[PDB]
Structure formats: C-alpha cells, structure tokens
Enzyme design. Sequence first.
Site, PDB file in Angstrom:
ATOM      1  N   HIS A 102       0.756  -1.214   0.012  1.00 15.38           N
ATOM      2  CA  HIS A 102       0.040   0.001  -0.041  1.00 15.38           C
ATOM      3  C   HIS A 102       0.770   1.209   0.052  1.00 15.38           C
ATOM      4  O   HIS A 102       0.557   2.269  -0.628  1.00 15.38           O
ATOM      5  CB  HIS A 102      -0.888   0.265   1.146  1.00 15.38           C
TER       6      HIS A 102
ATOM      7  N   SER B 226       1.543   4.059   2.260  1.00 12.63           N
ATOM      8  CA  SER B 226       0.968   5.406   2.522  1.00 12.63           C
ATOM      9  C   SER B 226       1.908   5.989   3.541  1.00 12.63           C
ATOM     10  O   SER B 226       2.423   5.340   4.477  1.00 12.63           O
ATOM     11  CB  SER B 226      -0.234   5.274   2.906  1.00 12.63           C
TER      12      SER B 226
ATOM     13  N   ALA C 215      -6.970  -0.418   9.252  1.00  9.88           N
ATOM     14  CA  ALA C 215      -8.113   0.096   8.520  1.00  9.88           C
ATOM     15  C   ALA C 215      -8.053   1.122   7.758  1.00  9.88           C
ATOM     16  O   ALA C 215      -7.524   2.079   8.088  1.00  9.88           O
ATOM     17  CB  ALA C 215      -9.385   0.480   9.775  1.00  9.88           C
TER      18      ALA C 215
ATOM     19  N   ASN D 275     -11.323   7.436  -0.709  1.00 13.20           N
ATOM     20  CA  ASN D 275     -11.745   8.947  -0.808  1.00 13.20           C
ATOM     21  C   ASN D 275     -13.238   8.995  -0.351  1.00 13.20           C
ATOM     22  O   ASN D 275     -13.306  10.158   0.364  1.00 13.20           O
ATOM     23  CB  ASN D 275     -10.973   9.546  -2.021  1.00 13.20           C
TER      24      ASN D 275
ATOM     25  N   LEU E 251     -13.264   8.634   3.048  1.00 11.76           N
ATOM     26  CA  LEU E 251     -12.631   9.529   3.834  1.00 11.76           C
ATOM     27  C   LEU E 251     -13.063  10.940   3.736  1.00 11.76           C
ATOM     28  O   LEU E 251     -12.852  11.698   4.702  1.00 11.76           O
ATOM     29  CB  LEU E 251     -11.172   9.556   3.406  1.00 11.76           C
TER      30      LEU E 251
ATOM     31  N   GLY F  52      -5.044  12.415   1.829  1.00 12.74           N
ATOM     32  CA  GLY F  52      -5.397  12.444   0.513  1.00 12.74           C
ATOM     33  C   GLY F  52      -4.283  12.486  -0.561  1.00 12.74           C
ATOM     34  O   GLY F  52      -3.321  13.140  -0.485  1.00 12.74           O
TER      35      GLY F  52
ATOM     36  N   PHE G  16       4.476   6.733  -3.328  1.00 11.05           N
ATOM     37  CA  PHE G  16       3.340   7.269  -2.856  1.00 11.05           C
ATOM     38  C   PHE G  16       3.709   7.843  -1.345  1.00 11.05           C
ATOM     39  O   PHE G  16       3.785   8.853  -0.915  1.00 11.05           O
ATOM     40  CB  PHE G  16       2.222   6.495  -2.891  1.00 11.05           C
TER      41      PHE G  16
ATOM     42  N   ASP H 138      -2.081   1.530 -14.316  1.00  8.85           N
ATOM     43  CA  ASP H 138      -2.770   2.426 -13.736  1.00  8.85           C
ATOM     44  C   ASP H 138      -4.141   2.628 -14.362  1.00  8.85           C
ATOM     45  O   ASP H 138      -3.998   2.898 -15.672  1.00  8.85           O
ATOM     46  CB  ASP H 138      -2.011   3.632 -13.537  1.00  8.85           C
TER      47      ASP H 138
ATOM     48  N   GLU I 246      -2.268  -3.272 -10.449  1.00  7.18           N
ATOM     49  CA  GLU I 246      -3.076  -2.544  -9.181  1.00  7.18           C
ATOM     50  C   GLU I 246      -4.020  -3.494  -8.829  1.00  7.18           C
ATOM     51  O   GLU I 246      -4.808  -4.196  -9.845  1.00  7.18           O
ATOM     52  CB  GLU I 246      -3.476  -1.017  -9.691  1.00  7.18           C
TER      53      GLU I 246
HETATM   54  N1  LIG Z   1      -2.611   3.434  -1.957  1.00  6.39           N
HETATM   55  C1  LIG Z   1      -1.479   3.773  -2.644  1.00  6.39           C
HETATM   56  O1  LIG Z   1      -0.848   4.707  -2.305  1.00  6.39           O
HETATM   57  C2  LIG Z   1      -1.193   2.932  -3.832  1.00  6.39           C
HETATM   58  C3  LIG Z   1       0.029   1.931  -3.825  1.00  6.39           C
HETATM   59  C4  LIG Z   1      -0.065   1.301  -5.056  1.00  6.39           C
HETATM   60  C5  LIG Z   1      -1.072   1.902  -6.111  1.00  6.39           C
HETATM   61  N2  LIG Z   1      -1.975   2.483  -6.103  1.00  6.39           N
HETATM   62  C6  LIG Z   1      -2.195   3.264  -5.009  1.00  6.39           C
END
Ligand SMILES: NC(=O)c1cccnc1
Lengths: 422, 58, 211, 170
Positions: A89, A91, A102, A106, A109, A118, A159, A182, A277
């Site tokens: 993921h 993030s 959890a 968007n 959220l 975001g 990301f 994507d 993805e």
């Molecule tokens: N949730 C993300 O940042 C993410 C990771 C990989 C692909 N798309 C989104």
Amino acid sequence: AAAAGKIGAFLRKAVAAQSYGLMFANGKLFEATGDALEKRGQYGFSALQRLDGLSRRNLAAVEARLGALDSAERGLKERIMTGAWHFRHQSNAALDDGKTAAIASNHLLARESRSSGGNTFAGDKALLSNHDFVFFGVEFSGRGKQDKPLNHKHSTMDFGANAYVVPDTLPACRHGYLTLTDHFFNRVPGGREAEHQDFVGSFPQMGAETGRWIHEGKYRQNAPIFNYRDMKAAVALHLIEFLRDSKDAAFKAYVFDQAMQSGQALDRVLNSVFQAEFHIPRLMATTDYAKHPLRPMLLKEAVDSVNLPALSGLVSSKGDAVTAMWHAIDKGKDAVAAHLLGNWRFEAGDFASAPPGFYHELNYALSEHGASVYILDQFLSRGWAAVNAPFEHVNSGETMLDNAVKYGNREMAAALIKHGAD
Amino acid sequence: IREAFRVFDKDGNGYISAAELRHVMTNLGEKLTDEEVDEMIREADIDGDGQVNYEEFV
Amino acid sequence: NSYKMDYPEMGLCIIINNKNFHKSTGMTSRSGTDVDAANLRETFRNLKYEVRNKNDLTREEIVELMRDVSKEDHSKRSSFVCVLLSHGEEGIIFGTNGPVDLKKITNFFRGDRCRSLTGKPKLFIIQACHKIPVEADFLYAYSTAPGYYSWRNSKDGSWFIQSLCAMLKQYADKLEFMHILTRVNRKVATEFESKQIPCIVSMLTKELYFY
Amino acid sequence: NSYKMDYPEMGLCIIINNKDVDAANLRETFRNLKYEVRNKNDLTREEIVELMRDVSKEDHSKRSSFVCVLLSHPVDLKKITNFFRGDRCRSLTGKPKLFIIQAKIPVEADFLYAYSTAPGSWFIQSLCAMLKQYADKLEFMHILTRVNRKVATEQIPCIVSMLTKELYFY
Ligand SMILES: NC(=O)c1cccnc1
C-alpha cells in the site's frame, strides 16, 4: 448455530455493490464504451454481474485472439496462475493502530467524516469515478509478509514511506478487480524510467518494447478490468502475448530461468513488463498484515498526511516547530496546529519572515484561499498578527478582510470583523 | 435465495431486528473488525431492517 | 545597432497570476502557479527590474491595473515588461470572473495613447494554457501547453517559463532576446518528446540587450 | 546552435506573383545565394496549392533549407502549410521553411513568416538591399529587424518565428 458467515459474506457483497455502483453509474469512459449503469443511490448485485461479464469478455477476447499455445507456453500459465500474491500500500499516514489496520477510500474518507490526508491528481472524478477504492500495488515474489518487499515504487511515483503488506488470503479481496496498468494512466513505463534499472539494463532489447504500449485500443483510454477469478490467468495470457512479439535473450533464458525460483526472477520480470494494481472496495479491515518501514518520514508528509505519532518524533526543537507550524498554516490542518500549540510556546518574533521554501508572508498565508479559520483565530488571539495591516509584496494595498471577501468565506469574514475593526 | 431469508432466525418480526445485536454478533462469533461491522450496519441504512424488505436487493 | 537600454533604472515589471478561478466560469483551477510566479519574481528581479505581483484579479481589475500604469511616467526607465499567467484560448486571456481581450490590454500602450514610452520595448509573455495587433516595438512571447507528462507533482510549474528563467540566468548577459527565445523554444519540444510549440511574434526595430 | 547549410544544395526558392521589378530583383538576390529559383506568374488559386503539394513530394534530402516567396494581392494559407507539416515531408524535417509573404497563423515546429503591408515595393527592396549588404555577418533575425527599422522609418512587418536554432547564410 455459528451461521454468521451467511450474513457476513452477504453484507460484504452488499458493501461492494455500492462501490461499483459509482464506477458504473458515473464516468465518461464507461458511458462512451457502453458499460455504464444508472444513478439510483442504492445499487444492487447488477454492479457485480456487470463486473463479472466485463472480466469474462476481457479475458476471453485475448484468449481467443491469442494462439492455441504449446507445451512450453502453457506451463507458464501454471507457474504464474498457481502462485502467491501479496499487496503493498505504501502510505505515509498513521494506520497501524497497534493490532488493527483499517484503510478507507476517498469517497469514505470525505463522506462527512473528514480525516485529513489525500493523494489524487485532477482527472479521476470524471473519466472513471473509481475514487471509492483502496488501491493496492501487487507483488509476485510469493514469500512471506515479514520480509521487506523488494519493490519500492509504483509506475513513477513513490506514494508513501511506510509499506503495509497484506496477504491475498483475506476475505475482502473477493470483489477486488485488477488492472495491468494504472486505471487512469494506462501506460506501461518505458525501459528507462522503470525501477530496478540493473535488471532492465542487463537485457537491452527488452526496454525498447516494454515502453508505452496501451491496452484495449478500441477506445485508446481503456484498460481491461479483471475480477478475482480471472485476474491470475490474464497476467500470464498477456505475458505470452508480449513474449511472442519479442526477439531477445530474455525471451528464453530468464523467463525460463525463473521456473525454479519464483522470487526475484518472477517479480522483477512481471513488475517490469507490467505495473499492476488491485482495487479493493470501500474499506480493508484486517488483523494480519506487515508494517514495513522503508524510508524515514518528512515534515511535509507528516503534516500533509496528519500523523501525530510521527510528527511528535520528527519535531525535535522549536527551530523545527516553527517550520511545522508554517507547513500547517498553508494547508489548513487544524489538528497539527492544535498539537504544536499545546506542545510549544511561540513568540511573535519568529513569525516575521517566511522560512526559505515558502512564497507568502504571514498575513497573506493566513488569508489566502485554502487557509483555515481555526488557525487564523488562534493567531489573532495570541496577537502574532495585525488584523489591520496591508500586504507589501503580493496584492499591495489590500488587507486580509479584502481576501476574506473576495473568496467568500463568511465564517472567516465574520471572524475578522469581530476579532478586529477593519 | 431462501437461505438469505431464513438465516435471519434471530428476527425482530419485520423491524430493526436488534441492530445492536447485529453489531455485537458479527464481532463475537466470526472474528471481524469493528471498522468493518460499523460500515456494514451503516450500509444497512435506517431503522427497520426487515429481513425481506432489506434484501429486495437483486 | 543595439538599443541603449542604459537609463537610470531598467524598466518596470508586472506579473499577474490567476490560480483559483471563480466558480462562475466553470474552470476548476490551475495547479502550482505560485512557484512559477515566484520563479519569475526572482529571475526578473535579478535583472534590476521592479516586479509587482498581482494574484487572482478580475477583468475590471486587470484593465484598470493596466490603465493606471499606462499613465505613469516611465521617462527615466528604458523598457517595460508584462507577464500574464492565466487560462485562455488562442487570443483571449481569462480573469477569475471572465475573459478580457488581449487587444484591449495593449491599447493603453499603443504609442498614440501614451508618450512616456516612445519607441520603447514593451515585452509581453503570455502563458495562457492569435488575432494579435501590431505596433512599434511590441514583442509577444506566447505559449499554450501544460507540458508533456509527469503531471504528478507539478514539478516546478510548466516547461516554458522555467526554461525561460534558466536561459535568462546565464545567457542574458551575452546574447540578445531573440536568441534566448529561440534557445527556450529549442529546450521546449526537446524535453517534450513522447504536442504544441510556442510562437514568437516580434515587431522590434532594434536589438534588445539586457545590459 | 546553427542550422546546417552544408548540404549539397542550399534549398529551393519559389517566387510567385499572383496578380514586377521587386520579383525581378528577388531573382538575382536569391540566385547569388546559390539557390534554385522557380519563378511563376498569375495563377488560379487551386493549381498553386497543388503545385506546393507537388514540391512537397520531392527528395529534399540534399537541400539545406527551403524558401517560399509569395507576392500576392482569396486563398487559404492553411491549404498550403498542410503539405509541409514535416510529418509527411521527411526530407525537410529539422530544416528551415521560410515563408516571405506580402499581401491568424498556423503554429508548427519549424516555420517562419514575414507578413508585410500592401502599400518596387519598399519591403522587398529593403529586404534585397539588406541581404546584399549584410548576409555574411548577421543572422536572419537581425536582418529582418533592421528591415523592420528601415520600413518603419522610410504598419510594421511581423515576424512569426518558430525556429529552434539559428539561421546563417555562409
Ligand atoms: N494506496 C497507494 O498509495 C497506492 C499504492 C499502489 C498503487 N496505487 C495506490
């Protein structure tokens, strides 16, 4: 009787239907292609039947168009089809919760429950309307979660800085569709702008053909979507299609040197030919996962994606507290401002100049389009800014009330005329 | 299809059917997460979760 | 024949930015134009100019702002530079509220409506992402493109008015403006490959040297 | 930084008089530059378009540049540029396409216009004299700016330059 499965597995479908309802109701692409539904607020199982049909057709088309294969190019459809897949993921937010992960989308959220964060560039809300999906990057290594992933970046963008690896065996992945690129940027990265340049530089001719070759060219901006059942066959069936249009030493000597080692010889191949993805519905609740720290955080990411546990460690002294407050001012993050004010005692001396990297003075930062009323009022209460003082650099002559009137913030205009004279 | 009807043995006779009991039973008995069950009950909409009225859903 | 720009002070500079468009038009917004405005700020202030930022103006504000600078006394300064960061079509520029014709912006600088700049370079740099008028020493550098790719991050605004700053950082002390503009137009469409290219309209009657 | 003009020939040179001494002067002032001058006369404005289509399909791989002078007075310039987008004319891509015109613009990667005022002609005579005096010293943009100065001193000709590098004539 322990028959709660018959309601859990049904309510999971009920939840996923409402998230495929948005994607099949809105979206320019699905209306143009003819795969769109109506707007009815509360959708039904038709939002699942349509996905099932789409996956069936998108797999059967390439299967029929592809040749009948042979003894060599049908074992690959068993080394790949019968594998182990794990989703990353990446993030920057604070999601561990100790023993419960959890991650929401968007559309959840921002559905009147506004948790700060975001990451989305303009364009996704109109073409597809899939902003109700927890996107996941796929990993083909097959080994356990507790080992740090060998991948670090998606198509081009890193990301986050905190990998959240989960196994395929979750019951929430049943209704998660997969796409080889994507969904909006349907573009395989070229052989030069791809991660792990050592492997790609080892095979020179591969990079010339793993470039920008789009999929489903009947409308240019399509990308096929495969459900859970039909997502593992379509990866091998497209690897075969790419391979039987390639003339390289990799076409034999690595793609069949990966047979006995399905780790860094299968992942490095597939994540270079494709950029997959996974799109899970509204929420992903699990008790088993892997929180792998890949890269140390940054003040910009800790403030943008509000993460107090990381912020309280990144901020070490007042010299960084001022920078964190300046980051919070030009984003409207009230929680970060409250945290900093509760854990620090400032003074009007250090707020008299924009730190290197910022392009606005304090009185313009507090009064611009995206500024927050809470921070403005707090700064006025501490008396760190003059309510009646004109801008010198940008828009010279005007004042903060003029900005509040231009943009229409009634809650800010009232707070300005009340806390001062103007 | 009749299984969807009759698994709801713990019925409220065409009513809310104990939304609190629905919240707590999925928590204890199948080992879900609260952030998921509170989403399921929210998707169950408003009070009056009729066993037949809710699943005019196909 | 050079231009003899060696007046007491070296001209005026005006920068206009539109980033948060008024919702009455329909355009959502423009992303990352503040960095472009700051880059132009620094680059043109390096040239001994007097920049004046004006963020998020309307049609009636733009026209009056241009008019009230037309009536100034530019007698001690040797040039004038105007930069317009906004949205628009081939020959129309958009304020926050609506469109204002580019013709009615240069009318107050036609030479018959202002005597302060008689035969003086009135540079115009429009980045509106072609019915141009004609008079005296007007030079229009017009471009319309968001870029080639890499949308993600709006890394330093757009190609045109960062390559422009790059060339004015180094070349602007030995070359003249037509050459700098050609090198900018070369860096664009080169770091743009897999499509639009800027155009350079120039009615200058001399050679523009920034030193 | 400079367009290469060391190719076998230094391009073509097509002069059109759609309706005298100005074109006559253009004859020698471009022939001395080692060009292939193709003079013409009054035409109907469809056969001329077909002619530019014909010269568009030619082995310009040996030419260094290309010039197209239009002494005109009811036809579209887009219908002339359409054959010169460089995407079809593979032998002219990356090489100049000069369009000197005397009587809206099409934007393209490597063109250049020389619009003028209908009131020999002062524009053409000034251009010929300037190219005779300074050809081996200054590049083309400075030549055209001095031409602008001369015309405006003794409406101002426009210069819509989409060039990517410099021009020179030696
Ligand atoms: N949730 C993300 O940042 C993410 C990771 C990989 C692909 N798309 C989104």
